[PDB]
Symmetry: C3
Subunit: 167 residues, 3 copies
């Protein structure tokens, strides 16, 4: 009732963790090491399942550090109540593909990764390490009413049909 069921699907999974006791979200960790080149897309596995109860939705979203410092973009996942599969981090390296080469991959803090064994990478490539903190899960109540088709609404609003307005 004030409890959320969490299922760890492999040895690579980490239990989600809340930094401060009043923060919104539970930190989410990668269960896989992946390199993403510029423009490359992936669904990164967490090997974590949850059982969000009816009346709620999970928002599987970015962290402020990773999104602001790198070109790694996470599309917010709407995690349905009842979904018991592996939580997937839906991600793109949105660094441009400019055809330049470099010796340095970048980590999720945008720091150059110095390797003893030197290799050539596409400029703007990132490595995500297993066990790194790349997303968070925030759970929010939802309203799911019956839909009633109408020809006209039962009240006239101040806003009306106005949208996509200027600044």
């Amino acid at each position: 009732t004030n409890t959320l069921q969490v299922k760890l699907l492999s040895k690579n999974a980490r239990m989600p963790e809340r930094n401060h006791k009043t923060d919104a979200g539970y930190d989410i960790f990668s269960a896989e090491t992946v390199v993403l080149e510029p423009q490359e897309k992936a669904v990164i596995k967490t090997d974590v399942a949850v059982s969000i109860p009816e009346g709620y939705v999970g928002l599987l979203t970015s962290r402020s550090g990773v999104s602001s410092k790198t070109h790694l973009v996470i599309e917010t996942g709407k995690i349905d109540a009842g979904y018991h599969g592996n939580l997937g981090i839906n991600i793109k390296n949105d660094h441009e593909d400019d055809k330049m080469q470099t010796i340095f991959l970048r980590n999720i803090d945008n720091e150059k990764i110095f390797e003893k064994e030197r290799h050539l990478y596409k400029l703007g490539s990132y490595r995500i390490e297993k066990g790194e903190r790349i997303a968070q899960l925030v759970i929010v109540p939802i309203w799911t009413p019956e839909l009633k088709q109408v020809e006209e609404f039962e009240s006239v609003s101040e806003r009306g049909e106005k949208g996509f307005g200027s600044s």
Copy 2:
């Protein structure tokens, strides 16, 4: 009270549909056939209006299939209580514009569209078909208090001024 008013604005509109009875969102369908080239932006019409009541906001957001499989990016629309206009899907084909040509448009499952009448397209172009399911609407309660300007807050938090932290 557990009812949402929905107004269909044309013959091309489809009534929004919830897949599972505990899912968060109502599937939203395009009322238009559009081709989007790489980097092209549009507001796609649903020809659907709704009357979200005070105390709530609608989140007009992506589906997991379309966002993960294509370069089609939907910016989450915050649908105001009282807004009675046509719901617009705010979208970009974020495929890079690399100047390559192809015979194949892609659908929203990222499958090549085979045509009897062959044409040249920009590589990374998508067609969205009228009646296709490209977004969803999730409704969430909101807190809208009066704002009280202060010189200092009435409590000291654990978090304090910390933000945009590392991993």
Copy 3:
């Protein structure tokens, strides 16, 4: 209790404003003038602090006008209850870097900015002016339960492990 504490951190700050009395969000204004070139990223300062109470999260998100009309992309910030720092607008000019030059910067309505003193800019560059309305803050209640690790969930759902489905 129906009150939100707001702290103005400088003379460049503006008090957040709700357009209609039933709208979801409080408009948020830039405290800085910045030019963003294609692919450039920034955290734009508002010089505004807030004290979101426990049980809520702030969503610092785009406006419909700016996102639909420009290539300026704002990543939704999850503003923690207790965070008392300067609200940062996490932004990218996602206009492609095509190496073309122009005399015209664009404003956030995507209008060309005519200058008496003519200068060369990168095509797709935007200027954000201090005091312009570029984001909004929507506050939403959250559920933050204790996590209970399990080997199997206490109910079988209709959805099950299904996710990232087709259209």
